Structure 1
């Protein structure tokens, strides 16, 4: 009843979630080098004051509902096998700052999944190869990177994101359309070969190539 931390890592044989039916005062719970596939649903019924929750290197199939527990600050669920995210995963969850989901099997994120959370500062959904990405309620994050999402081709709306500063999109065609530099730094830099406004660039050179194709064929047929 006084335990604060519990950091198990490298426990590469345990395949069941530990029994915590009496520990209700821990701050950070970490099971990193594990093999855990079933987080019990009855989690927020206890541990009512944790401010960290790390379960990275352990194959997790799905997630429970974090209904309540509005003291949770950071989460990290990497390297898992989370195929889907339901809408009730983040009900409430005030003062949640960082949320990573990198390197999983996410392919569909429900639209109403980020509308209830508090002021998230960072949110990384990377290398998941999803198809669509809802932006409802993400109007407060300062860094959001989606790199290994080559299946995602949709262009993100810049109206929702207001105070965003760092953005890493799969293709360099969302960052340019985002119209950054409010100044926004984007890792997949569009450079010069990949434009957003005009393919030919300035209006001077366009007037030049307009003459080339106009004459390269009118005389050629003769």
Structure 2
């Protein structure tokens, strides 16, 4: 049942993987469930080389030298649910060969040289779920080929050369939950580029060339997760997220944000993770109601001097807080947000700290106060903080080191303080 080079398993899978083979091995069982041809030298495929396998559900050609594929090279697989073509030499989408894989739920064309997509690509695949186009030479989003995929739940166009996303490019994919555009060249988004996708919960625009805020996302009522980081965006309007009330996670960092509406982050009750970094010119804080449910907050690279009392009355969910690398000169009491396990205050201008500031925080393992100006610390401040394995006081102006308990902590960094008494 199993020809020499391959190996055949319990469930009817046959691994010809990594055999240095130029052609489909002959002698394989016709009851083969799965076939793995990955990592071989197969340069080309002949007519119907898979026709003798009627039951074959999964076909892995990943990582071969395959350049072109005869239109009929797969005919006999109407039961095929998954086809992995990744890491091969394809300069184009094998449109004709994909005619009549009518059962196909997974198509990986990612990591090829693909420049062009023939207009009729993916015409019959009505069952397709996952389409991987990424890591290719794609110059534009293939509107026609994607109009044939009403079942698609997930798509990656990432790591291509795309510069612009036309209006209604995704218009026919209503089942789509996940759209990945990251690491393209995109400079321009049509106002209607995202129209039609009312099920999309996840959008990746990261590592692109964007400049305006992408208000196209107003077409996305189901949006949960949004990345726009590493772009050129200069402005986050108030009204930015108004039409996306379900957002849990926003990644905005690595943009030259010169401006952020104070209220841009208002009224997001599902928002658990908010990351803002390296916004150089942005001078100030968020309004942040009705967002009380925030889990992790990162705000760094700015001018803010301080934080409101309401902050820890209203956020009872907050676990990690990264305020580092700001201009902050002062600190409110943190007792309120009881869920705090991590607080990073380092590289600010803060001068002093009191007792109750860190009072009643049970779960806090990590506190980084390092690289500040702090000239003194009250003796009873850290008495209350357990779980604490890491306290970084290093690189301040302080002349005397507090306790306790600093006893039993795994790390206490006191380095770089001008401690006059110890020098003696």
Q: Please state which structure has a larger fraction of its residues in helix.
A: 1
CA shift at 1:175, angstroms? Answer: 9.8
> Is the 1:124–1:146 contact (alpha carbons within 8 Å) kept by the matching residues of 2?
yes
- Which ranges in structure 1 are unaligned for 5 or more consecutive residues? 204-222
- Match 2:296 to one of 139, 143, 147: 143
Compared with structure 1, are the counterparts of its residues 110 and 72 closer, same or farther at alpha carbon in structure 2 (3 Å cutoff)? same
CA shift at 1:154, angstroms? Answer: 2.4
CA shift at 1:84, angstroms? Answer: 0.2
CA shift at 1:61, angstroms? Answer: 0.5
Q: Equivalent residue for 1:22?
A: 172
TM-score, normalization by structure 2 = 0.42
> Is the 1:173–1:196 contact (alpha carbons within 8 Å) kept by the matching residues of 2?
no
Q: Equivalent residue for 1:187?
A: 344
> Is the 2:263–2:287 contact (alpha carbons within 8 Å) kept by the matching residues of 1?
no
Q: Equivalent residue for 2:206?
A: 56
Encode CA deviations 1:125-160: one digit per residue, 9 max, x unaligned: 11122211222323221111123x1x4132121313
- Match 2:276 to one of 95, 118, 125: 125
Encode CA deviations 1:162-183: one digit per residue, 9 max, x unaligned: 2222111134885971433625
Equivalent pairs counted in the alignment come to 198
Q: Equivalent residue for 1:95?
A: 246
Q: Equivalent residue for 2:354?
A: 197
> Is the 1:36–1:58 contact (alpha carbons within 8 Å) kept by the matching residues of 2?
yes
Q: Equivalent residue for 1:213?
A: none
Q: How does 1:70-85 map to 2 (within 5 A)?
A: 70-85=221-236
In 2, Cα distance between equivalents of 1:67 and 1:183? 33
Cα RMSD of the aligned pairs, angstroms, is 2.8
- Match 1:10 to one of 134, 159, 175: 159
Encode CA deviations 1:91-147: one digit per residue, 9 max, x unaligned: 142221110101101121112212232320110011122211222323221111123
Compared with structure 1, are the counterparts of its residues 63 and 173 closer, same or farther at alpha carbon in structure 2 (3 Å cutoff)? closer
Compared with structure 1, are the counterparts of its residues 132 and 139 closer, same or farther at alpha carbon in structure 2 (3 Å cutoff)? same
Q: Does 1:42 align with 2:192?
A: yes
Q: Equivalent residue for 2:319?
A: 165
CA shift at 1:52, angstroms? Answer: 0.2
- Which ranges in structure 2 are unaligned for 5 or more consecutive residues? 1-149, 356-374, 380-424
